Amino acid sequence: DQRFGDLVFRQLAPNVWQHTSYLDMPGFGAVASNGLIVRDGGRVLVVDTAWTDDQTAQILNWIKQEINLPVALAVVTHAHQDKMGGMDALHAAGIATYANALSNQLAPQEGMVAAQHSLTFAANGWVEPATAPNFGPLKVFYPGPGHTSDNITVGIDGTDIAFGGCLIKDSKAKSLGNLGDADTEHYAASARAFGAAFPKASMIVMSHSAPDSRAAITHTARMADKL
């Protein structure tokens, strides 16, 4: 793990890096949010933002420092403070923001900035290619209602890595986390939908825990099975 100011960066794969932003909550401690940075040739693709615009700006600084390549687009998993905190930062940097059509609608409701582009999914939950242009190895998939009704997942094509966001937890998770705007009925199905979408993905990266194995998916499903 390499520390860059207030954020931590860890290389998972040669072209796939993980970022961890920490938010100090008075009386609770430092909360951590993970994200993914993928290098597709001569362009950079970012998955999810940090807690704040400042922290997200640091990520862009790191990308320019190490990779030294421009970010093509940035896609978030859902309209939440732990994932869409640096939307304005990307807009200021001139980066195309991609988000679920529902997320863009929920953004002004959760008190966040909506993305410039909206993603639409089919009946099976797969993203419409028309709304996902020049995504490269970013295969977006909508598992359904889980942590939220707008939560989505992203798979890194060409590799065995998949981003579960905040929908999926680790194999040693004792809690599902925030279940406020979550669905306790379809959660058990959505967790499995993600696993069925990316069965060749062994590296399951989440936003609140280190990259686990496929056991994390089944664990989340089993925990949601009792919801």
Ligand SMILES: O=c1c(O)c(-c2ccc(O)cc2O)oc2cc(O)cc(O)c12
């Ligand atoms: O995923 C969240 C989370 O784990 C948490 C979280 C924080 C503290 C805690 O004890 C448990 C949590 O799930 O923070 C969030 C705050 C948000 O506004 C939206 C979120 O999706 C989260």
Ligand SMILES: [Zn+2]
């Ligand atoms: Zn959330």
